[PDB]
Amino acid sequence: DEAGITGTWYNQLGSTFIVTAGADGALTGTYESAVGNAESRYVLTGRYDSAPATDGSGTALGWTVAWKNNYRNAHSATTWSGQYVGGAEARINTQWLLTRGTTEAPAWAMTYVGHDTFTKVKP
Amino acid sequence: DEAGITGTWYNQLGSTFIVTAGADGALTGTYESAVGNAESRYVLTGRYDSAPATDGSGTALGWTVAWKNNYRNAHSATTWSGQYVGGAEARINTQWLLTRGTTEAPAWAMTYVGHDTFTKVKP
Amino acid sequence: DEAGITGTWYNQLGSTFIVTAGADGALTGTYESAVGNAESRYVLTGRYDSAPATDGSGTALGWTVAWKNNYRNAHSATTWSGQYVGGAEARINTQWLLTRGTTEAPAWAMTYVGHDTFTKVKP
Amino acid sequence: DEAGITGTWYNQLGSTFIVTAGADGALTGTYESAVGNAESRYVLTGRYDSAPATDGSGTALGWTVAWKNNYRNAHSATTWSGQYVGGAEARINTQWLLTRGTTEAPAWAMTYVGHDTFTKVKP
Ligand SMILES: NCCNS(=O)(=O)c1ccc(NC(=O)CCCC[C@@H]2SC[C@@H]3NC(=O)N[C@@H]32)cc1
Ligand SMILES: NCCNS(=O)(=O)c1ccc(NC(=O)CCCC[C@@H]2SC[C@@H]3NC(=O)N[C@@H]32)cc1
Ligand SMILES: NCCNS(=O)(=O)c1ccc(NC(=O)CCCC[C@@H]2SC[C@@H]3NC(=O)N[C@@H]32)cc1
Ligand SMILES: NCCNS(=O)(=O)c1ccc(NC(=O)CCCC[C@@H]2SC[C@@H]3NC(=O)N[C@@H]32)cc1
Ligand SMILES: [Ir+4]
Ligand SMILES: [Ir+4]
Ligand SMILES: [Ir+4]
Ligand SMILES: [Ir+4]
Ligand SMILES: [Ir+4]
Ligand SMILES: [Ir+4]
Ligand SMILES: [Ir+4]
Ligand SMILES: [Ir+4]
Ligand SMILES: [Ir+4]
Ligand SMILES: [Ir+4]
Ligand SMILES: [Ir+4]
Ligand SMILES: [Ir+4]
Ligand SMILES: [Ir+4]
Ligand SMILES: [Ir+4]
Ligand SMILES: [Ir+4]
Ligand SMILES: [Ir+4]
């Protein structure tokens, strides 16, 4: 799955996820969001299960982007959790949590939840 | 917040999160879970907003653990998303997503959601 | 949106959601899941915003199914939260939480998160 | 658990949840939020597993509030999913999803996730 994962992925919004999978389980790369308070590339880091159960079973993985680079600071961070499924139409199906840096007035409302599907071809 | 974050944290279950915050926004360290299919330490990586809005506002951050080390492979990965709040009782308040590597029979049921609060003193 | 909502909806898994929207904001109906520990129809109840902001804006809503009927007891319950969007291809886009009745050994792992999209035509 | 559930509950924010559990699995009542865009009581409806596995196991349940009453319309709705645990310190431990009625500019950001713990005594 190392070879499967490494590369460029696109989600349903047009965002671009460029990642390298390490042999040890590391994930490193850059993320560019087509939406929100974001411009250009942001660093990402994460992990994956580098010894999946190959018996028709996806590979677990996750990663994080803090939404600060040289251009913008959106005072927020997103984590995606999901699985890589290989094959002719390879996908990474994820859910995500986006937490914003705020005061303790709306701290109850600090996190969005959503989902992203990544494919090797761009919509 | 770099100095604030770096160190050892404990959640309400007794798990131990040892992290170093980089000046650039990197998070690196190890995680030991007191529960689930887990034993000893696991690598973690993540990111944080290294230029918060200091106006009473938390620092956004997240990180990932893939639940494979030399002892066990739980074919899963967890991402935590939340915020660091500094001060006399410093906390990292998070929500988390745990995705399991499974077939496409229960792929609809691939992810748990939960929440963890981390403190500098252990319960 | 009352007229919009009331009716039969289908999700991407083949499940069937039959609902009536009340003028007061009530939602009542039955749910049949194509997957999981489920057979035949289950009662549902929920609510919707019966005075949306009609300025291109979806209508907020949610509902609950407890997964017990005359045939099966799956000791669980699911809530869906999302929005109705009207028009030629009307949709209800939701996220959901499914909580299982368990002991306090895996209570940290009590809830799944997922997402469903409902359409008026069945896949 | 019918007798257990029916009554007045308080969460960690000071909100008040007044509910009646039906013998058939119905939940009906009113919710008053101490926070957000909310004033006075709002109708709620939901369901619970009215034949739990009494072997130390919680009772699954959920419910919905649409945040419109005679005073305010917050164009949103919240669903809570969780479990009732009985005894000397009875609790309802939940996670929740709050979806807002918005356009398809930030539809990716339509839902918050959080968690509430309800007790029979108010903080
Ligand atoms: N009131 C002030 C602003 N309003 S606010 O609500 O407080 C708020 C604050 C910060 C954000 N932060 C971002 O906008 C960064 C990019 C997020 C891209 C997501 S990351 C998940 C999803 N997938 C993707 O490829 N792009 C999207 C979002 C909303
Ligand atoms: N049917 C086979 C097993 N059953 S299964 O359901 O498929 C399943 C599969 C894998 C897992 N994976 C783990 O158990 C690793 C540690 C998780 C620790 C969490 S991580 C969030 C929480 N916080 C913490 O400090 N510890 C806990 C959990 C459940
Ligand atoms: N170890 C014992 C069983 N394993 S367990 O993990 O503890 C567990 C326990 C109970 C359930 N409960 C159901 O299976 C009922 C139907 C759920 C349908 C969902 S509801 C959201 C989604 N949308 C839909 O239309 N169908 C699906 C699921 C998993
Ligand atoms: N930009 C315009 C407003 N900003 S917005 O972000 O779009 C937005 C829109 C609507 C809401 N809707 C409410 O505020 C109603 C009460 C929610 C109470 C929760 S319900 C879960 C939690 N538990 C509880 O007892 N009270 C709290 C929240 C945020
Ligand atoms: Ir395996
Ligand atoms: Ir918070
Ligand atoms: Ir919280
Ligand atoms: Ir979707
Ligand atoms: Ir700032
Ligand atoms: Ir899946
Ligand atoms: Ir999905
Ligand atoms: Ir809690
Ligand atoms: Ir309006
Ligand atoms: Ir629990
Ligand atoms: Ir909890
Ligand atoms: Ir999807
Ligand atoms: Ir039982
Ligand atoms: Ir949406
Ligand atoms: Ir969506
Ligand atoms: Ir909490």
XYZ file of C-alpha atoms and ligand atoms in Angstrom:
624
model
C 0.000 0.000 0.000
C 3.021 2.319 0.279
C 3.131 2.537 -3.559
C -0.656 2.784 -3.714
C -0.760 5.807 -1.412
C 2.167 7.900 -2.476
C 1.133 10.513 -5.059
C -1.433 13.142 -5.797
C -5.061 12.857 -4.755
C -8.126 15.038 -5.409
C -11.300 15.393 -3.411
C -14.855 16.180 -4.505
C -14.266 19.933 -3.915
C -11.178 20.146 -6.111
C -8.651 20.199 -3.281
C -5.226 18.615 -3.867
C -3.475 16.309 -1.406
C 0.155 15.396 -2.312
C 1.573 12.748 -0.092
C 4.502 10.423 0.390
C 4.076 7.271 2.386
C 7.168 6.086 4.310
C 8.019 2.391 4.703
C 7.743 2.868 8.509
C 4.101 4.311 8.343
C 4.893 8.000 7.985
C 2.797 10.331 5.800
C 4.243 13.663 4.746
C 3.245 16.072 2.026
C 1.180 19.194 1.239
C -2.459 20.081 1.059
C -4.162 22.762 -1.019
C -7.828 23.461 -0.256
C -10.129 24.669 -2.990
C -12.455 26.168 -0.327
C -12.408 28.035 2.921
C -9.811 30.394 4.314
C -6.880 28.993 2.470
C -4.416 29.806 -0.233
C -1.625 27.825 -1.746
C -0.024 24.770 -0.015
C 0.059 23.800 3.605
C 2.217 21.277 5.308
C 0.692 17.945 6.319
C 1.765 15.068 8.412
C 0.133 11.802 9.422
C 0.368 8.025 9.714
C -0.854 4.860 8.097
C -1.021 1.107 8.911
C 1.994 -0.097 6.902
C 1.077 -3.810 7.347
C -2.613 -4.002 6.360
C -4.633 -7.225 6.526
C -4.627 -7.976 2.779
C -7.843 -9.998 2.737
C -9.948 -7.422 0.835
C -9.402 -4.905 3.686
C -8.627 -1.156 3.477
C -5.594 0.471 5.023
C -6.202 2.773 7.966
C -4.691 6.156 7.953
C -4.939 9.818 9.043
C -3.316 13.174 8.734
C -3.405 16.781 9.943
C -3.115 20.250 8.364
C -2.722 23.395 10.449
C -4.099 26.185 8.288
C -1.086 28.575 8.565
C 1.467 29.101 5.839
C 3.362 32.246 4.505
C 0.153 33.849 3.223
C -2.683 33.218 5.633
C -3.437 32.170 9.184
C -6.829 30.722 9.575
C -6.311 29.833 13.269
C -7.597 26.321 12.712
C -6.539 22.817 12.034
C -8.228 19.808 10.222
C -7.612 16.073 10.787
C -8.781 13.466 8.293
C -9.281 9.789 9.369
C -10.108 7.103 6.954
C -9.027 4.330 4.677
C -7.102 3.715 1.444
C -8.667 1.168 -0.868
C -6.490 0.084 -3.811
C -7.332 -1.045 -7.371
C -8.546 0.293 -10.703
C -10.546 3.066 -9.016
C -8.336 3.601 -5.890
C -9.853 5.819 -3.198
C -9.173 7.337 0.188
C -12.487 7.663 1.990
C -12.265 9.925 5.007
C -14.158 11.816 7.651
C -12.680 14.965 9.042
C -12.747 17.258 12.082
C -11.867 21.015 11.696
C -11.252 22.778 15.006
C -11.051 26.588 15.125
C -9.046 28.654 17.614
C -11.711 30.595 19.563
C -12.480 31.994 23.017
C -14.532 30.033 25.669
C -17.788 31.820 24.662
C -18.487 29.421 21.739
C -16.002 26.654 22.820
C -18.966 24.258 22.730
C -18.978 25.092 18.994
C -15.268 24.674 18.310
C -15.344 21.737 15.781
C -16.905 21.021 12.405
C -17.343 17.456 11.103
C -17.411 16.484 7.440
C -16.317 13.889 4.943
C -13.999 13.859 1.882
C -13.463 11.218 -0.810
C -10.133 11.310 -2.600
C -9.452 9.877 -6.052
C -6.371 9.783 -8.265
C -8.245 11.672 -11.027
C -9.603 15.146 -10.519
C -13.357 15.871 -10.890
C 2.363 28.129 22.970
C 5.333 26.032 21.802
C 6.566 25.863 25.441
C 3.016 25.344 26.684
C 2.468 22.298 24.479
C 5.722 20.434 24.627
C 5.673 17.780 27.370
C 3.628 14.980 28.792
C -0.156 14.990 28.849
C -2.733 12.600 30.340
C -6.316 11.994 29.344
C -9.335 10.963 31.414
C -8.671 7.256 30.637
C -5.072 7.292 31.842
C -3.477 7.392 28.400
C -0.153 9.226 27.985
C 0.637 11.626 25.148
C 4.298 12.811 24.972
C 4.815 15.530 22.465
C 7.303 18.056 21.180
C 6.088 21.147 19.427
C 8.396 22.532 16.702
C 8.826 26.275 16.120
C 7.494 25.738 12.552
C 4.171 24.037 13.750
C 5.298 20.419 13.824
C 4.100 17.966 16.497
C 6.028 14.759 17.051
C 6.038 12.314 19.918
C 4.522 9.059 21.236
C 1.165 7.912 22.453
C 0.337 5.137 24.907
C -3.332 4.166 25.232
C -4.647 2.824 28.502
C -7.530 1.132 26.612
C -8.292 -0.762 23.469
C -6.047 -2.941 21.358
C -2.816 -1.311 22.288
C 0.378 -1.914 24.153
C 3.336 0.280 24.812
C 4.140 3.424 22.725
C 3.100 4.358 19.246
C 4.483 7.012 17.018
C 2.493 10.214 16.529
C 2.702 13.138 14.246
C 0.614 16.267 13.787
C 0.480 20.047 13.480
C -0.446 23.133 15.417
C -1.114 26.854 14.726
C 2.259 28.296 15.788
C 0.985 31.927 15.667
C -2.264 31.862 17.684
C -4.473 34.928 18.145
C -3.436 35.718 21.737
C -6.640 37.502 22.731
C -7.911 34.800 25.134
C -8.033 32.299 22.220
C -6.961 28.618 22.156
C -4.397 27.199 19.779
C -5.664 24.827 17.114
C -3.972 21.563 16.652
C -4.259 17.882 15.642
C -2.378 14.656 15.431
C -2.551 11.039 14.261
C -1.565 7.617 15.651
C -1.567 4.487 13.507
C -2.053 1.627 15.945
C 0.917 -0.540 14.781
C 4.181 -0.851 16.643
C 6.604 -3.835 17.337
C 4.030 -5.653 19.477
C 0.578 -5.256 18.000
C -1.246 -4.303 14.831
C -4.701 -3.109 15.456
C -5.342 -2.224 11.780
C -6.662 1.191 12.724
C -5.711 4.769 13.103
C -7.015 7.668 15.359
C -6.862 11.431 14.680
C -7.444 13.973 17.434
C -8.500 17.593 16.589
C -8.784 20.237 19.169
C -7.294 23.106 21.064
C -4.564 23.893 23.607
C -5.571 26.345 26.301
C -2.720 27.615 28.498
C -2.573 28.719 32.161
C -2.669 27.332 35.687
C -4.866 24.403 34.622
C -3.624 23.996 30.984
C -5.691 21.645 28.823
C -5.913 20.144 25.370
C -9.575 19.559 24.603
C -10.074 17.287 21.626
C -12.509 15.235 19.624
C -11.274 12.188 17.831
C -12.052 9.863 14.917
C -10.828 6.184 14.991
C -11.073 4.435 11.626
C -10.639 0.648 11.413
C -9.298 -1.293 8.427
C -12.265 -3.444 7.314
C -13.898 -4.932 4.215
C -16.768 -3.153 2.293
C -19.453 -5.161 4.182
C -19.447 -2.788 7.207
C -17.589 0.141 5.483
C -20.566 2.316 6.454
C -19.434 1.524 10.024
C -15.726 2.217 9.608
C -15.278 5.167 12.081
C -15.841 5.805 15.772
C -16.140 9.342 17.183
C -15.213 10.346 20.719
C -13.634 13.040 22.819
C -10.537 13.271 25.077
C -9.437 15.973 27.527
C -5.733 16.143 28.274
C -4.187 17.658 31.395
C -0.612 17.999 32.621
C -1.462 16.009 35.787
C -2.654 12.440 35.657
C -6.077 11.449 37.093
C -40.480 22.908 2.500
C -43.214 20.877 4.226
C -44.365 19.613 0.781
C -40.761 19.184 -0.334
C -39.909 16.912 2.592
C -42.931 14.723 2.993
C -42.544 11.460 1.050
C -40.177 8.631 0.391
C -36.417 9.049 0.275
C -33.566 6.654 -0.568
C -29.954 6.738 0.499
C -26.808 5.540 -1.269
C -27.064 2.122 0.472
C -30.626 1.433 -0.645
C -32.274 2.263 2.671
C -35.788 3.757 2.636
C -36.884 6.719 4.747
C -40.657 7.490 4.658
C -41.514 10.701 6.363
C -44.288 13.183 6.970
C -43.453 16.743 7.823
C -45.943 18.534 10.117
C -46.798 22.225 9.694
C -45.468 22.805 13.256
C -41.958 21.230 12.501
C -42.672 17.619 13.405
C -41.166 14.696 11.460
C -42.715 11.262 11.805
C -42.407 8.159 9.689
C -40.516 4.862 9.258
C -37.035 3.817 8.338
C -35.864 0.602 6.695
C -32.105 -0.004 6.583
C -30.598 -2.008 3.766
C -27.573 -2.805 5.993
C -26.652 -3.701 9.513
C -28.671 -5.480 12.160
C -32.049 -4.527 10.880
C -35.126 -5.956 9.291
C -38.302 -4.361 8.118
C -39.484 -0.886 9.310
C -38.608 1.047 12.400
C -40.313 4.024 13.866
C -38.701 7.443 13.459
C -39.271 10.825 14.889
C -37.554 14.177 14.470
C -37.848 17.894 13.762
C -37.244 20.440 11.064
C -37.008 24.261 10.733
C -40.504 24.983 9.379
C -39.647 28.635 8.513
C -36.381 28.402 6.537
C -34.522 31.464 5.247
C -35.586 31.153 1.589
C -32.588 32.956 0.110
C -30.986 29.874 -1.510
C -30.629 28.265 1.960
C -31.283 24.637 3.014
C -33.708 23.620 5.720
C -32.224 22.196 8.899
C -33.546 19.004 10.235
C -32.864 15.778 12.180
C -34.376 12.533 13.267
C -33.816 9.399 15.351
C -34.392 5.643 14.933
C -34.072 3.213 17.829
C -33.232 -0.117 16.229
C -35.958 -2.217 17.971
C -39.138 -3.373 16.307
C -41.201 -6.687 16.465
C -38.407 -8.706 14.845
C -35.045 -7.548 16.111
C -33.387 -5.592 18.886
C -30.078 -4.227 17.916
C -29.596 -2.334 21.216
C -28.652 0.834 19.381
C -29.992 4.055 18.080
C -28.987 6.378 15.118
C -29.570 10.146 14.777
C -29.235 11.916 11.440
C -28.604 15.724 11.280
C -28.579 17.605 8.087
C -30.352 19.684 5.522
C -33.114 19.458 2.904
C -32.346 21.205 -0.359
C -35.289 21.520 -2.770
C -35.502 21.590 -6.592
C -35.198 19.338 -9.626
C -32.704 17.061 -7.857
C -33.948 17.497 -4.222
C -31.663 16.049 -1.547
C -31.326 15.551 2.176
C -27.634 15.604 3.016
C -26.930 14.273 6.480
C -24.310 13.111 8.917
C -25.224 10.529 11.472
C -24.235 9.162 14.886
C -25.038 5.482 15.809
C -24.650 4.726 19.512
C -24.661 1.107 20.728
C -25.821 -0.111 24.142
C -22.649 -1.544 25.740
C -20.906 -1.965 29.097
C -18.283 0.570 30.435
C -15.361 -1.554 29.105
C -15.588 -0.083 25.559
C -17.787 2.971 26.475
C -15.059 5.130 24.917
C -16.041 3.299 21.702
C -19.809 3.657 21.976
C -20.547 5.778 18.816
C -20.003 5.473 15.080
C -20.080 8.521 12.777
C -21.060 8.441 9.116
C -22.899 10.288 6.401
C -25.967 9.564 4.210
C -27.326 11.380 1.149
C -31.013 10.929 0.440
C -32.672 11.381 -2.948
C -36.244 10.982 -4.166
C -35.128 8.332 -6.704
C -33.547 5.082 -5.651
C -30.013 4.136 -6.824
C -35.331 2.320 32.064
C -38.588 4.129 31.226
C -38.780 5.343 34.871
C -35.048 6.044 34.897
C -35.248 8.340 31.875
C -38.407 10.299 32.391
C -37.711 13.603 34.173
C -35.466 16.603 34.149
C -31.814 16.460 33.165
C -29.023 19.065 33.171
C -25.879 19.231 31.103
C -22.451 20.673 31.895
C -23.447 24.045 30.340
C -26.573 24.485 32.448
C -29.047 23.503 29.744
C -32.282 21.758 30.780
C -33.725 18.701 29.045
C -37.244 17.660 30.216
C -38.323 14.377 28.798
C -40.966 11.695 28.995
C -40.159 8.195 27.898
C -43.070 6.204 26.405
C -43.495 2.466 27.018
C -43.217 1.945 23.218
C -39.762 3.779 22.940
C -40.967 7.318 22.320
C -39.179 10.364 23.777
C -41.005 13.672 23.932
C -40.324 16.812 25.902
C -38.634 20.242 25.801
C -35.120 21.547 25.684
C -33.759 24.856 26.952
C -30.184 25.733 25.976
C -28.074 27.872 28.256
C -25.891 28.862 25.257
C -26.097 29.785 21.631
C -28.920 31.384 19.702
C -31.704 30.203 21.896
C -34.284 31.422 24.324
C -36.858 29.613 26.349
C -38.080 26.049 25.515
C -38.000 24.152 22.282
C -39.835 21.043 21.341
C -37.932 17.754 21.227
C -38.645 14.325 19.988
C -36.642 11.111 19.855
C -36.448 7.390 20.577
C -34.905 4.924 22.957
C -34.306 1.133 23.164
C -37.198 0.175 25.466
C -35.864 -3.396 26.007
C -32.191 -2.905 26.953
C -29.821 -5.810 27.617
C -29.799 -5.538 31.428
C -26.378 -7.103 31.956
C -24.604 -3.896 33.075
C -25.385 -2.302 29.668
C -26.578 1.257 28.888
C -29.750 2.066 27.012
C -29.359 3.559 23.555
C -31.239 6.633 22.694
C -31.386 9.879 20.669
C -33.379 12.994 20.103
C -33.676 16.138 17.980
C -34.377 19.846 18.587
C -35.088 22.262 15.749
C -34.064 25.661 17.072
C -37.322 27.539 16.218
C -39.959 28.479 18.745
C -42.213 31.633 19.226
C -39.224 33.867 19.989
C -36.299 32.942 17.790
C -35.379 31.081 14.633
C -31.841 29.971 14.588
C -32.200 28.082 11.270
C -30.537 25.010 12.718
C -31.206 21.715 14.316
C -29.219 19.503 16.835
C -29.404 15.707 17.290
C -27.988 14.002 20.367
C -27.063 10.251 20.297
C -25.978 8.411 23.325
C -26.776 6.238 26.271
C -28.669 6.290 29.580
C -26.864 4.639 32.461
C -28.950 4.137 35.618
C -28.041 4.093 39.337
C -27.035 6.394 42.177
C -25.332 8.827 39.785
C -27.542 8.262 36.662
C -26.242 9.843 33.456
C -27.036 10.324 29.800
C -23.752 10.530 27.926
C -24.180 11.872 24.421
C -22.471 13.194 21.342
C -24.271 15.675 19.189
C -24.415 17.074 15.649
C -25.716 20.676 15.039
C -26.474 21.418 11.390
C -27.099 25.013 10.269
C -29.284 26.107 7.352
C -26.824 27.749 4.918
C -26.164 28.259 1.205
C -23.865 25.907 -0.863
C -20.846 28.251 -0.415
C -19.927 26.806 3.028
C -22.070 23.591 2.757
C -18.858 21.652 3.434
C -18.996 23.442 6.815
C -22.646 22.808 7.641
C -22.280 20.674 10.856
C -20.700 21.058 14.277
C -19.886 18.037 16.471
C -19.765 18.085 20.259
C -20.599 16.139 23.370
C -22.945 16.662 26.364
C -23.223 14.785 29.668
C -26.569 14.975 31.420
C -27.137 14.441 35.139
C -30.221 14.592 37.344
C -28.613 17.343 39.478
C -27.645 20.688 38.047
C -24.001 21.901 38.156
N -15.747 33.442 11.962
C -14.395 33.550 11.395
C -14.282 32.496 10.299
N -15.397 31.507 10.323
S -15.122 30.170 11.236
O -16.302 29.376 11.105
O -14.764 30.525 12.583
C -13.873 29.335 10.528
C -12.542 29.548 10.894
C -11.487 28.934 10.208
C -11.721 27.990 9.163
N -10.609 27.409 8.554
C -10.442 27.282 7.158
O -11.474 27.680 6.366
C -9.262 26.654 6.509
C -9.526 25.673 5.359
C -10.583 24.558 5.733
C -10.722 23.653 4.528
C -11.684 22.433 4.787
S -10.603 21.187 5.511
C -12.032 20.034 5.351
C -12.641 20.298 3.920
N -11.927 19.471 2.901
C -11.164 20.383 2.049
O -10.388 19.942 1.022
N -11.372 21.765 2.326
C -12.314 21.802 3.483
C -13.054 27.747 8.824
C -14.105 28.430 9.482
N -13.707 -6.494 15.726
C -12.244 -6.498 15.876
C -11.895 -5.427 16.904
N -13.038 -4.521 17.215
S -13.137 -3.177 16.276
O -14.283 -2.470 16.751
O -13.160 -3.520 14.879
C -11.800 -2.246 16.600
C -10.621 -2.367 15.861
C -9.460 -1.670 16.219
C -9.449 -0.735 17.297
N -8.253 -0.068 17.564
C -7.698 0.086 18.852
O -8.424 -0.378 19.906
C -6.430 0.805 19.139
C -6.419 1.777 20.326
C -7.618 2.808 20.287
C -7.467 3.713 21.490
C -8.547 4.857 21.534
S -7.816 6.170 20.541
C -9.217 7.219 21.121
C -9.365 6.926 22.664
N -8.448 7.814 23.441
C -7.407 6.968 24.026
O -6.400 7.476 24.788
N -7.585 5.572 23.806
C -8.817 5.455 22.972
C -10.640 -0.585 18.011
C -11.784 -1.350 17.678
N -20.747 -6.533 18.415
C -22.197 -6.740 18.294
C -22.649 -6.025 17.024
N -21.610 -5.113 16.468
S -21.676 -3.565 17.015
O -20.610 -2.886 16.352
O -21.636 -3.521 18.452
C -23.103 -2.910 16.476
C -24.273 -2.961 17.238
C -25.499 -2.518 16.726
C -25.598 -1.910 15.439
N -26.857 -1.475 15.023
C -27.407 -1.732 13.749
O -26.617 -2.374 12.845
C -28.743 -1.261 13.301
C -28.844 -0.646 11.899
C -27.769 0.486 11.645
C -28.003 1.017 10.248
C -27.056 2.222 9.886
S -27.945 3.661 10.506
C -26.661 4.668 9.648
C -26.458 3.995 8.235
N -27.457 4.538 7.265
C -28.388 3.456 6.942
O -29.433 3.627 6.087
N -28.058 2.197 7.521
C -26.833 2.443 8.337
C -24.421 -1.822 14.693
C -23.204 -2.338 15.199
N -23.248 32.941 11.430
C -24.612 33.044 11.969
C -24.623 32.312 13.307
N -23.403 31.483 13.529
S -23.513 29.930 13.007
O -22.254 29.336 13.326
O -23.888 29.873 11.620
C -24.672 29.178 13.930
C -26.013 29.136 13.540
C -27.002 28.611 14.381
C -26.680 28.011 15.635
N -27.729 27.491 16.393
C -27.902 27.720 17.775
O -26.933 28.428 18.418
C -29.014 27.159 18.585
C -28.660 26.553 19.950
C -27.478 25.505 19.869
C -27.257 24.973 21.268
C -26.161 23.844 21.328
S -27.085 22.338 20.976
C -25.539 21.436 21.414
C -24.984 22.137 22.714
N -25.617 21.534 23.927
C -26.489 22.548 24.518
O -27.227 22.311 25.637
N -26.434 23.822 23.881
C -25.484 23.656 22.742
C -25.334 28.017 16.007
C -24.356 28.614 15.175
Ir -4.001 -8.568 9.464
Ir -14.053 23.740 23.188
Ir -16.052 19.670 25.317
Ir -20.915 12.754 0.431
Ir -4.820 36.282 15.165
Ir -16.048 3.184 4.596
Ir -18.868 7.075 3.182
Ir -16.796 13.888 28.482
Ir -34.374 33.589 7.756
Ir -19.673 5.948 26.546
Ir -17.328 10.365 26.835
Ir -19.766 9.953 0.669
Ir -30.253 -7.946 25.150
Ir -23.675 20.484 3.204
Ir -21.201 16.247 2.199
Ir -15.972 16.762 27.952
